[PDB]
Symmetry: none
Subunit: 83 residues, 12 copies
């Protein structure tokens, strides 16, 4: 939701488990070509920037899916960002 837009820079600079999020979002929110494009980036911040480049076409539901995946993967990161 609005969470990923409010903490965009922190999420880009601090998310470390990107492949899990990609697998969670595959098919439902991400097409195969976008999946490969994100996966082809060198570093984790680059991968997160490429993934965020697709966010303008997302509605509230897709952002909620991403937030749920983040909560399942890195609960501590989400708790820290909320605090």
């Amino acid at each position: 939701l609005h969470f990923i837009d409010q903490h965009r820079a922190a999420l880009i600079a601090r998310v470390t488990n990107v492949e899990w999020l990609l697998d969670a979002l595959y098919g439902k929110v991400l097409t195969d070509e976008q999946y490969q494009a994100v996966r082809a980036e060198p570093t984790n911040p680059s991968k997160m920037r490429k993934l965020f480049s697709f966010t303008p076409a997302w509605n509230w539901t897709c952002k909620d899916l991403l937030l749920q995946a983040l909560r399942e993967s890195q609960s501590y990161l989400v708790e820290d960002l909320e605090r």
Copy 2:
């Protein structure tokens, strides 16, 4: 805590019992995929650098857990670094 960030290079170059720390952090701070990824590195400094690559997503509590595991495993190393 801030201890692991203060002594990052020394911890990378001097920690010798990495599997014990991985077992301590498994399931709570490290996912199974990250566990295998760290375990697949050739040398101890490589394993420590791969483990530290996941640090930016950690909060204070995860770093406290890592420091407690280090104290339990290598008390002498922690005492030397503090001194």
Copy 3:
């Protein structure tokens, strides 16, 4: 079949015997270069993701072969996923 696409994330994160599947699929579905490319990945999830990267070129028969190999190797995993 559609089974490997319905449970893509679970199969990626839970398949542990990858070399047996690679041997089962060698020649018939996988070329030698793709075989080495999959075999060169560090961890099991990495190998599974690399193998799934070749899926878009597969028809129903290739996916059926993969599912049959999975049933022969890990019957319990397939039974759990179906349930």
Copy 4:
């Protein structure tokens, strides 16, 4: 069952009779290749970590089989861990 996941680190660090467990789990939970791979590790903790690397594919029944084998082999260890 969930017992082996709850006491993963203790089981890795404390199980001493691994060959008996491997023989108990051979064929029905462990393939021959996995049996050889576990048997090729140098030390008991290494063998236990290699064996636990196959657990993500296991369902509840396989973990029950492992727990039953542990109870038959080292009852005292199981009672100590439960207490």
Copy 5:
């Protein structure tokens, strides 16, 4: 010959005496470096897969030599595979 390519998976999963084959193939089909590389694998299936990784460069004569070595070492395995 084509026999080792037709029964590749079975040969990998069932050949148990690899050292004799390596000694038979040393010098004339296998270089010293390849010999050492095959020797370094943990398990018999791993050794056989490493050995098979060199097969793309082999001609018919090398495969005939390997088949002759297999017949000399494990005649029963070859007879079972043909049947």
Copy 6:
């Protein structure tokens, strides 16, 4: 036959004189190197496990020979295992 695969664990844990069986199987099923490798194990269960490590390459006839040797050596063990 299938008997030695059905009672693998019991045969490993209960066979007493492996040297007689090794003499019976020498040359016909076991090469000299395999004979020496089995003979070099410390304990009887270790010897039986090493011997069973060669069984994947065996056909029905070799297992029948082993069962006949067992019947000649320990009739009582075979009768106990049947019931």
Copy 7:
């Protein structure tokens, strides 16, 4: 109890009646395979080290049994170690 952990090196280097202790601990603390494995060591210190290799799985009751068996076996050694 904690006694065998406090005087581990002294017990390893000074215990001379090992077969009696093995008989005392047989069945209830030691399996048959472990019994045979300990009996296969060349020297008394090696046997005692092999026996101590199984202590990580033991609880307080098993160590108490070992200490009691030592007390009947070599009372002078125990009272010298306590002093």
Copy 8:
């Protein structure tokens, strides 16, 4: 010579021992940086393609050196390709 250009695809897909060729060509045809770049590829076809990427800057003598190295390493492959 023209041999490597005529059989480029087969050489890429069938050459299995690349490190020997790299050592043979080091210093005379390959710089240290090119050597490291070729050595960093995951699979044998990738290494061969990376090595062939340097071909356009070679004259007849360098290609002759590569062919001589191939004859010394894989005589059977060269005879098969010529036939």
Copy 9:
């Protein structure tokens, strides 16, 4: 200092322990993203070129830190370059 700018090509082509320098410069001169970007290069010259791409933003103090790290790591290389 001006030393690294005077010997840029030699340092790029001859520095072999880059990870130690990266650890020395982490946090103080290099950000986490720059650290990952440098670490993602295939070969040592590529890593050195990527690291040198950040030097236009450095003052005298950062270059002094890099030179001190080089002296600590490769004293012989610095002495050779100065000579």
Copy 10:
């Protein structure tokens, strides 16, 4: 102390009684897993190299303990090395 670092190669090549040192260093300087890892090496130089691989984490006190154990075990070796 610095003695074991000044005479590292000589200590690796000349120490013959490693079991006594391992028993002396058990628990207080060496964890159980490290003890088993050192005990699994084939030869005495291999055991000493494995033991020395743990030295980067040691402080002055641990090295002093090792030197005291060496003096108690091999007085002649220490006297020769000092001279």
Copy 11:
């Protein structure tokens, strides 16, 4: 000296006692991390190539040290290479 550069391929393919050279060069030409990295290679040629990967940073004195270590370890190999 220039000897190791002139006979690079032969030294890579023929040096058999690498651990002795590593111990000789430890602490003077090789850091601990490089020592571990070289020690982690599977085969002797792999270890030699990994060691030679650090050559570009060496000056004449380091190569002289390596040549002296080779003369002390394999006098016959050096004599054969010289002629």
Copy 12:
């Protein structure tokens, strides 16, 4: 000489008295560490394979010494291998 390379497999599979050859080659051709490494193998073929692992570093004189020792030890084996 070339004799041990022409009959490598036969010598590996047929030499039965290895200690005498090791004692003959001690110091002059074999270092103490290599002597211990060869002596630690389980079976005679394994010991001979470990011994032949050091052959590539040998010149003609070392092979002549080994052949002379073989003639002193097993004259009948050499005479049989000649014909």
